Amino acid sequence: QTVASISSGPKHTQKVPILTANETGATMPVLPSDSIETRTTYMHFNGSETDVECFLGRAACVHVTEIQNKDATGIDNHREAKLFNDWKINLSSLVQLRKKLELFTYVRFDSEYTILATASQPDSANYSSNLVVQAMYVPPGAPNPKEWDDYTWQSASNPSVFFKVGDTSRFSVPYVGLASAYNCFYDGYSHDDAETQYGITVLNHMGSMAFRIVNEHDEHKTLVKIRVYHRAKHVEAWIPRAPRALPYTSIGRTNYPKNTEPVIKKRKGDIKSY
Amino acid sequence: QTVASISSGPKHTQKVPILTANETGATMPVLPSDSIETRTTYMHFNGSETDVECFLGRAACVHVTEIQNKDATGIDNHREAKLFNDWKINLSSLVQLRKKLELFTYVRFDSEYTILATASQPDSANYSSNLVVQAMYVPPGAPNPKEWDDYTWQSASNPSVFFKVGDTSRFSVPYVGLASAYNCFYDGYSHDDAETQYGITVLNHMGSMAFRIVNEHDEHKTLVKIRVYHRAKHVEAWIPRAPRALPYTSIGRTNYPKNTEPVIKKRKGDIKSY
Amino acid sequence: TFTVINYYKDAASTSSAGQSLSMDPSKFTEPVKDLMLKGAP
Amino acid sequence: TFTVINYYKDAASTSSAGQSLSMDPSKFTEPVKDLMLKGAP
Amino acid sequence: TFTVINYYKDAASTSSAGQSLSMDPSKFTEPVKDLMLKGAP
Amino acid sequence: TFTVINYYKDAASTSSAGQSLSMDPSKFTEPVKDLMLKGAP
Amino acid sequence: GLPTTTLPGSGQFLTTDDRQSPSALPNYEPTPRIHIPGKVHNLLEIIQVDTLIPMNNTHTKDEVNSYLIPLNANRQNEQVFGTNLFIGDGVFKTTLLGEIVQYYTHWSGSLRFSLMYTGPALSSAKLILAYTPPGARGPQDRREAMLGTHVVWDIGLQSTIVMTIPWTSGVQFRYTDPDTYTSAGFLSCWYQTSLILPPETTGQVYLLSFISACPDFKLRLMKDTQTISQTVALTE
Amino acid sequence: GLPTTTLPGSGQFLTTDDRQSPSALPNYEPTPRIHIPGKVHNLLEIIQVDTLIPMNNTHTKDEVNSYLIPLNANRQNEQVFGTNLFIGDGVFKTTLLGEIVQYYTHWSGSLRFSLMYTGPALSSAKLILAYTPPGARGPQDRREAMLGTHVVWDIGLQSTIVMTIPWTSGVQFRYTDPDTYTSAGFLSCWYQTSLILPPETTGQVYLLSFISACPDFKLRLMKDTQTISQTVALTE
Amino acid sequence: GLPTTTLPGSGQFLTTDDRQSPSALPNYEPTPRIHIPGKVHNLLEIIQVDTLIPMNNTHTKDEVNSYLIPLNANRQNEQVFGTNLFIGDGVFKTTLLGEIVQYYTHWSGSLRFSLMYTGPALSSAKLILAYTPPGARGPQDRREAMLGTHVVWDIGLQSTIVMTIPWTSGVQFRYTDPDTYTSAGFLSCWYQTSLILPPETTGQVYLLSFISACPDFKLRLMKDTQTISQTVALTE
Amino acid sequence: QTSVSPSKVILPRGGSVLVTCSTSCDQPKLLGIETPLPKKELLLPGNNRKVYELSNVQEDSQPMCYSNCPDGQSTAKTFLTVYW
């Protein structure tokens, strides 16, 4: 048992632990036993749920897209027709997860993905199709499919998972960053140029996912909604950071919208009100 | 083998074990061997089914709600439309379980939940949809979803389980009470106030469950009935209590309805009738 | 005659614990003590 | 009380690692050092 | 040649017991005893 | 390199037996014996 | 992949299976267990505590008087009370023993029956409490009653008699619900001598009857209790 | 085939299950881990760092002034500030402690409250910082305040006072969201003597208030934070 | 998750699989086993008990007379009875051996055939009981009968002859249902000398024939019995 | 106590009659009607009351409702008569 508080009686100390200098930038560990007479209590607590592995470590929906299974004859832009959809993987699009991750500067983790496909048939349909989804992980910078039945889907190298709509797929992706950790913040440019983009960098490329319904068309249209869930595991985090206070406006940037509302709540009363 | 009864012959005892004083409030363990000549028998019995773990320890339906999968376009109150439903978890709504638990003052247990979803399509439908339910455990006091596709459902922290309608989900929740045990009875208030509620307390907050059908709408309406089954395990119980005799009227209160029927059966005959 | 492997890291995930061996009703049936033998602390 | 067999060859496939035992906040709370004891390399 | 692990805590859950080795029909086929050798208790 | 647990009590339930090691065709190819060495019983 | 064969019952939800299940709150640390007095391990521990029997259940409403067995002065060879011993029914249905008993289907073991006299100190009475084992009718006279298990109780400084109802059965378990085959017999109390009240006192004095289980008590097969009912879910 | 029986919950996606899963990039070798300073193992490590409290949150907009607690010269037996101790709310909502606290439902342990004086060196002041444990109102006069936990702070060469708010509760854990039952009490600061400014100086001097957690701090049940919200997915 | 591959037959209900299954009454303690005499471990134990053969099944109804084999005085070189040895058919169908045999498809082993004489003590008779192994017709005269397995039985103080029908077959098992290939042969009884009744006695005396199995008996392949049938479910 | 309805009935030869067995016990374990007649238990909810359609009544019969309820008489006989 780890002691939380030690028994401590009256103190006529000349080594005043309660007078310090915050000018130094140190949080001296002053305990209750230093300013009040205390009893001896035990922790009964390990702090398992505050470990970064747990704090940043449950599955969160990080992308949602709808794709369709329909007659593809006579369509030029299959992407526009929502026959397939791709998505550059990023954990920045959902703000809860982004703020949690942005509590740190550098983060290293392996990715466990869960893809949930759910079918809907809004228009008249005689039955529910037994559709199969192909979720193709394309490595960073690899060509995405350009049409629904492109040969890119038959890639001999791109990892692909085939699963029924209504069911899930699960697969882990190791940490794929070039550097020893992802740069959740980058104060630099890709090169010394006057006009080049700031912050957003290729260091944090985690890949991309393409989705299509493998089935040929039925007589009716089926709408499939794909939810990608990411779970970070084997998490390592460095350099704690000031938490995000203002809304986000874009991925990879710290920008916040103009004319934002005040973060700090105003007091109902003066500074003396409880 | 544990002895139930020992062989005992005629007794001319001056230490009369059958004359006592119930004024003292003790149930002296007088045995058959004390008042009658007995033979020696064995128990052949451990009392495994009377242990509190078993007595309070099978799955019971503790909540039932119906939700719908329908076209959500042009609806202001999704909760009223039964597109989703939430429920503050409590084991008081079913009287069998409540009376069993109320046999004790303090109870500590972990919760095993089983959610059964069953679909019905009363109106004309061409097929049975392959629907997916999201059961979201929201921690005590956390915001419940306000609309069917609110971002609260995509919570990066709230535990959620996705399962097909017609199938079940199962997940355990540890004991989540603030105090060392749940207060199945609380003779107090949240604070010293003249008007504050009595009995019902936040000490016994076990969380809450929100339910929706993840699927977008089909052409027809599907009615999904969600049954939540709770099973208490690792049960610890303190301070046995007088069993409940009268009907209940509310959760968290010991109130009973006015003009209730007599509990004690009236005798068909006088006090001498067998 | 019986076997259990723990498949999950949490104690809350384990199946029911079974029977409390040491059951003794004297707590409730024989709570009387003479207060003249100074049993009180 | 708990058991894990590795079913896959990759370290990325294993479940979460658990808790970092040796947690010490002095890195962040007590980063002050006297520079007159020559702690610098 | 054969293996069984008990997956449930109850004896009623186990599979069938198998064969009663010690089978002897004399209970039914040879129940005759001379009552003049005082076999009765 | 290979493992089998018997899950059923019956020998008929086991998978195929494999290869008969001791294969010798002389039963069929060399069935000739001189009958003047009295090999007959 | 390990070759497997899914058996019948796969995917069933049996409400009594009790297997391991994944936790929704991984790494959660519950509040430590502090010492609270009166921990209950087994329900066989608490049924051994005497509770009052509403033996005088002859009133239209539930009253304290239902628990008071009237005794009358100057009654000779007369009956005080008589009841059947269906512990999960009748006068026993509401007692702690009966309540815990109604949660199970089978019961075995001995019962502890107690009587406490509440009359004035200067009164006197000898009562005979008789247990009639099953197979015979409820005794209609004291002579019939005293042929079975009985205790002659002399009321004096010890105001309480404790008679055990010994487990008296062929079959090893009885049904908690009333059944002819598993009938438990009868319990009656009679005046042995009489009740004599001192001068300046008149009226009815009362007995309190208590029921409890002996340590050899058994309860087997869990069932729902028919004591409480609901037709609608409750709210806060 | 090994005979198996699939249990309820088979095929469910529980977002917190944490099992093994096949790798999509077999044989991939990730970049080696280099030493980066400031590794964070546990969030209980970083909540122990003091951050400023916007104690003076009386402004319409967010300003640096929200962090400056005004002190006035020649005030006697008067209050400097007063706040409730709902650490996941009010003045604490935006501090590092409050931010990390809003990710959990329960909290226990002691808080470290600090004040830094920023006035001229030739000034003097004695303040009394009082913690009123729950059950009593926020103190309305210094006499009431000094009956509870308090520290008389003499401002001099050491410009910083560190008062601990000892864990003072019956229940072992409090809710991070404001609740009457799990109320944590009140924090107030009062002039012990007064503030005296040297000649040639006038106006308001300021205190900086800091909050942090003691090493005995606990946070249990993870929840979403209500600090940031989104109605639309973000893009690049 | 342990990678598995579900095999064919997954989800099938095979009525003879005999696997473990979850209990609906966890922690239930069944009544202890008391000693009851006459425990049956194996059905091969009870088929070894002789039961009567309705050898004289020449009546329109079922009568006690069906069990009485008539013997007539002053018959010479004549047949008493003759039957085929399809033990699961004919005269054997209703005997205990035949009844237990009809629950199985194959049988092997020897049969124990007994005759008990019930005539007056002062009578005399020598009979020859012949077993004709398969391949030959049922013997039509005593000479033919006595070429096979036979026993010359002299009726006297020992009123019972026990002839064994030795397992006489090429194939190791016979079908319990009548089949030409697995025919078991014939059983006949003949007068060796004659039956002589004492004076003052006249009419038919009777033999009782019993059948049972020798300890070397075998029954293999379970099947339904065609002795009892139903077209409608029964109720109470 | 066990009860039978009707107490008595006169019915044509070969006709059907509905006989009701009831108990005072709310939860009886054994409850039925003893009769040599062909009978059919009517699908009815509950434990303490049963209804039987006794078909093809040919003679005077005395169907007895029976139960294991220990209150009062555990059996009750009804009297069927035939007219032809």
CA nearest G19 in B: which residue? B112
DSSP state of I146: T
Whether I86 and I184 have beta carbons less than 8 Å apart is answered as yes
Q: Tell whether D41 is within 8 A of chain C (Cβ).
A: no
DSSP state of H222: B
Count CA atoms within 13 Å of residue I59 on its CB side.
13
- Residue of B43, B46, B51 to mutate when probing chain C, most C C-beta within 10 A: B51
* CA–CA separation, A229 and A114 (whole Å): 5
Distance from the A62 Cα atom to the nearest Cα atom in chain B, whole angstroms: 9
* Resolution for this PDB entry, in angstroms: 2.4
Tokens found for residue J44? 């009815």
**E strands present in chain I:** 4-6, 51-52, 68-71, 79-84, 106-108, 111-117, 124-132, 149-155, 160-165, 174-175, 186-196, 205-213, 218-219
- CA nearest neighbour of B178 among D38, J76, E13, H104: H104
Which residue matches tokens 């703000």? A95
H85-121 core/surface letters (b: 16 or more CB in 10 A; e: else): bbbbbbbbbbbbbbbbbbbbbbbbbbbbbbbbbebee
With contact defined as 3+ CB pairs under 8 Å, the chains touching F are E, H
Whether I52 and I67 have beta carbons less than 8 Å apart is answered as yes
Its domain, for residue D33, covers: 1-41
First to last CA, chain D: 47
Give residues with Cβ within 8 angstroms of B102, minimum separation 6.
Answer: B184, B185, B241, B243, B244
Tokens found for residue B20? 């006592």
The rounded Cα F33 to chain-centroid distance in angstroms is 22
Mark the breaks in chain H: residue after which each occurs, C to N over 2.5 Å: none
Secondary element (H or E) of residue D9: none
- CA nearest neighbour of G218 among G89, G66, G111: G111
Tokens found for residue A215? 């089935």
Give residues with Cβ within 8 angstroms of B261, minimum separation 6.
Answer: none
Distance from the G39 Cα atom to the nearest Cα atom in chain C, whole angstroms: 9
Secondary element (H or E) of residue B135: strand B132-138
Its domain, for residue B216, covers: 1-274
* CA–CA separation, B135 and B61 (whole Å): 16
Distance from the G7 Cα atom to the nearest Cα atom in chain A, whole angstroms: 22
Whether A66 and A225 have beta carbons less than 8 Å apart is answered as yes
- CA nearest neighbour of H25 among C9, G108, A110, G142: A110
Beta carbons of B5 and G50 less than 8 Å apart? no
Count CA atoms within 13 Å of residue D24 on its CB side.
6
Whether G4 and B74 have beta carbons less than 8 Å apart is answered as no
- CA nearest neighbour of E29 among I55, I215, I94, I208: I215
Tokens found for residue I105? 């498809």
- Residue of H7, H15, H229 to mutate when probing chain B, most B C-beta within 10 A: H15
Whether H24 and A176 have beta carbons less than 8 Å apart is answered as no
User: CB pairs under 8 A, 24+ apart, for I195-198?
Assistant: I195/I71, I195/I72, I195/I73, I195/I74, I195/I75, I195/I119, I195/I123, I195/I124, I195/I125, I196/I73, I196/I74, I196/I123, I196/I124, I196/I125, I197/I73, I197/I119, I197/I120, I197/I123, I198/I120, I198/I122, I198/I123
DSSP string, G21-88: --BSSTT--PPPPPP-SSEESBTTTTTTS-EE------SSS--GGGGEEEE-TT--S-EEEEEE--TT
* CA–CA separation, H82 and H186 (whole Å): 7
Q: How far is CA I185 from CA A56, D16, H151, H191, in A?
A: 85, 76, 115, 123
Beta carbons of B27 and G158 less than 8 Å apart? no
Q: Tell whether F17 is within 8 A of chain E (Cβ).
A: no
* Sheet with strand G106-108: strands edge to edge: G174-175, G106-108, G218-219
Q: Which residues is H60 bridged to in the sheet? A: none
- CA nearest neighbour of I218 among I106, I133, I134: I106
* CA–CA separation, G202 and B225 (whole Å): 67
Whether H77 and H141 have beta carbons less than 8 Å apart is answered as yes
Q: Tell whether I27 is within 8 A of chain B (Cβ).
A: yes
Mark the breaks in chain A: residue after which each occurs, C to N over 2.5 Å: none
Beta carbons of H22 and D12 less than 8 Å apart? no
* CA–CA separation, A93 and A74 (whole Å): 34
Whether A57 and G25 have beta carbons less than 8 Å apart is answered as no
DSSP state of I104: B
Beta carbons of H3 and I9 less than 8 Å apart? no
* Sheet with strand G149-155: strands edge to edge: G79-84, G186-196, G124-132, G149-155
User: Chain E contacts of C3, Cβ < 8 Å?
Assistant: 5-7
* CA–CA separation, J43 and J26 (whole Å): 18
Which of A28, A52, A174 is opposite residue D12, by nearest beta carbon? A174
Secondary element (H or E) of residue G144: helix G142-145
Give residues with Cβ within 8 angstroms of B109, minimum separation 6.
Answer: B56, B175, B182, B232, B233, B234, B235, B236
Query: How many domains does chain B contain in total?
Result: 1
* CA–CA separation, H2 and G98 (whole Å): 47
Helices (H), chain B: 52-55, 95-101
Distance from the B99 Cα atom to the nearest Cα atom in chain I, whole angstroms: 21
Give the type of residue at I182.
Answer: T
Q: Tell whether H105 is within 8 A of chain A (Cβ).
A: no
Whether I201 and I120 have beta carbons less than 8 Å apart is answered as yes
Q: How far is CA B9 from CA B35, B37, B38, G170, I141, in A?
A: 10, 5, 7, 21, 77
DSSP string, chain F: -------SS-GGGS------S---THHHH-----GGG----
* CA–CA separation, G48 and G212 (whole Å): 5
Tokens found for residue B225? 């009935």
* CA–CA separation, B143 and H223 (whole Å): 10
User: Chain A contacts of B215, Cβ < 8 Å?
Assistant: 118-120, 225
With contact defined as 3+ CB pairs under 8 Å, the chains touching J are G
* CA–CA separation, J60 and J78 (whole Å): 11
Whether B157 and B231 have beta carbons less than 8 Å apart is answered as no
Beta carbons of D13 and H22 less than 8 Å apart? yes
Q: Is the dihedral of CA I179, I182, I185, I186 positive or negative?
A: negative
Beta carbons of G20 and C13 less than 8 Å apart? yes
Encode H149-174 in three state secondary structure.
Answer: EEEEEEECCCCEEEEEECCCCCCCCE
* CA–CA separation, H229 and H227 (whole Å): 7
- CA nearest neighbour of J25 among J46, J42, J39: J46
* CA–CA separation, G25 and G97 (whole Å): 39
- CA nearest neighbour of B235 among B181, B184, B198: B181
Which residue matches tokens 């005293």? G146
* CA–CA separation, H227 and H102 (whole Å): 8
* CA–CA separation, I85 and I92 (whole Å): 8
Judged by DSSP in three states, J51 sits in strand
- CA nearest neighbour of J26 among B139, B55, G90, A221: G90
